[PDB]
C-alpha cells in the first residue's frame, strides 16, 4: 500500500532518504494490535479514527481530550491520514489534565492500569503503549514504565524536549523502554530533542501534522510527536509477525536507518525509525 502526499513523518519512516512524499506500508497496517495512548485523551469521534479509537480510562473529571495533544499523538499512531498503523486499535488513557500536565502518581496509575486492562482486550498481535509525557527524573516513574514493559507491552516514551541528556528525565531514562528522540525533515536532530545513551531510536518529531480536537488537524513539534511514530511502527511490525512486544524496540533499532541524522552528539545512537517495506 502507498499513501501519496503523506505527512513527511510517515514518508520518512518508509524511506532510506529524506525529502520523499509517499508513505509505503504493508496492507495489514497494524490490524489486530492495540496502542494505548497515555496522554490528554483522544477525541475518539474524530473521523480520522474510523471508530478505531475509544477512551478506556481517565484520571480527571472528563474523559474528553480538552487539550488536543493526546488526539494528535493517537492520530500519528493510527489515524487514517496521519497514522503509521492505519488499522490499529487505539485506547486512550487520560493521565494529563486539559493543560497537558499530570502529577507523577497519576502517570504511574495510568501505566499500571494499561498493564492490567490489556488482559481484557482483544489484541492478538500485541499491545503497544505510547507515552508522550515526561518530567524530571523519578525512580518510581521509571519503575512504572519498566513494569508496563515487562508485563508484555511495548512501551515507547519521549526523550523530552529540553535539548539536554535524557538521563535526567522520566520515563525517558528508564533503560528497558524505548526512548524516542525527535528528528526534522532534513534529517537533523530536532533542536529541542533530548539526547544521550538512554535513547534507542529517533522518530519524526518536528512539524508533525496529525489530528486535533474539534475534528481539525494541526502541526506541532516535540519528541512527543516522534514517540507515536515509533509506537505505530512497533504496532505495525508486531502485526507483520516481525517482532514481539519484548523485542520490538531492539528490532526497530536493528532495522533503522543508520548514520542518517546530523547534530547527534557523540554517544547517542544515530538511528532513524524505518519500516523496511519492500
Ligand atoms: Ca531502551
UniProtKB/Swiss-Prot annotation:
Q: Per the annotation, how and in what number is the cofactor bound? A: Binds 2 calcium ions per subunit.
GO terms (BP aspect): proteolysis
Q: Which cofactors are required for activity?
A: Ca(2+)
* Keywords, ordered alphabetically: Calcium, Disulfide bond, Hydrolase, Metal-binding, Protease, Serine protease, Signal, Zymogen
- UniProt-annotated binding residues for Ca(2+) 1: 175, 177, 200
The Peptidase S8 domain covers: 7-278
Top EC class, one word: hydrolase
Q: Which GO terms describe its cellular component?
A: extracellular region
Keyword field contains Protease: yes
This entry's Enzyme Commission designation comes to 3.4.21.64
Disulfide feature? 34-123, 178-249
**Catalysed reactions, as listed in the record:** Hydrolysis of keratin, and of other proteins with subtilisin-like specificity. Hydrolyzes peptide amides
| Positions annotated as active site in the UniProt record | 39 (charge relay system), 69 (charge relay system), 224 (charge relay system)
User: Could you say which residues bind Ca(2+) 2 here?
Assistant: 16, 260
Entry's Gene Ontology molecular function annotations: metal ion binding; serine-type endopeptidase activity
UniProt key word Membrane: no
Q: What does this protein do?
A: Hydrolyzes keratin at aromatic and hydrophobic residues.
Q: Which family does it belong to?
A: Belongs to the peptidase S8 family.
Protein name per its UniProtKB record? Proteinase K
Q: Which gene encodes it?
A: PROK
Residues of the whole record sequence present: 106 to 383 of 384
Amino acid at each position: 500500500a502507498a499513501q501519496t502526499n503523506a505527512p513527511w513523518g510517515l514518508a520518512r519512516i518508509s524511506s532510506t532518504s529524506p525529502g520523499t512524499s509517499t508513505y509505503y506500508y504493508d496492507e495489514s497496517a497494524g490490524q489486530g494490535s492495540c496502542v494505548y495512548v497515555i496522554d490528554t485523551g483522544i477525541e475518539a469521534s474524530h473521523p480520522e479514527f474510523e471508530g478505531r479509537a475509544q477512551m478506556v480510562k481517565t484520571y480527571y473529571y472528563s474523559s474528553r481530550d480538552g487539550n488536543g495533544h493526546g488526539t494528535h499523538c493517537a492520530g500519528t499512531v493510527g489515524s487514517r491520514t496521519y497514522g503509521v498503523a492505519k488499522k490499529t486499535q487505539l485506547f486512550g488513557v487520560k493521565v494529563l489534565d486539559d493543560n497537558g500536565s499530570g502529577q507523577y502518581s497519576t502517570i504511574i496509575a495510568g501505566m499500571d492500569f494499561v498493564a492490567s486492562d490489556k488482559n481484557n482486550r482483544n489484541c492478538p498481535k500485541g499491545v503497544v503503549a505510547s507515552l508522550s509525557l515526561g518530567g524530571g527524573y523519578s525512580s518510581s516513574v521509571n519503575s512504572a514504565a519498566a513494569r508496563l514493559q515487562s508485563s508484555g507491552v511495548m512501551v515507547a516514551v519521549a526523550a523530552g524536549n529540553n535539548n539536554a541528556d535524557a538521563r535526567n528525565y522520566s520515563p525517558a531514562s528508564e533503560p528497558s523502554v524505548c526512548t524516542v528522540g525527535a528528528s526534522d525533515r532534513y534529517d537533523r536532530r530536532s533542536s529541542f530533542s533530548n539526547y544521550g545513551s538512554v535513547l534507542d531510536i529517533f522518530g519524526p518529531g518536528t512539524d508533525i501534522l496529525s489530528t486535533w480536537i474539534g475534528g481539525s488537524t494541526r502541526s506541532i513539534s516535540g519528541t512527543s510527536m516522534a514517540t507515536p511514530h515509533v509506537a505505530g511502527l512497533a504496532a505495525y511490525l508486531m502485526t507483520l509477525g516481525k517482532t514481539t512486544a519484548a523485542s520490538a524496540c531492539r528490532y526497530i533499532a536493528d532495522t533503522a536507518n543508520k548514520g542518517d541524522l546530523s547534530n547527534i552528539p557523540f554517544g547517542t545512537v544515530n538511528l532513524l525509525a524505518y519500516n523496511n517495506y519492500q
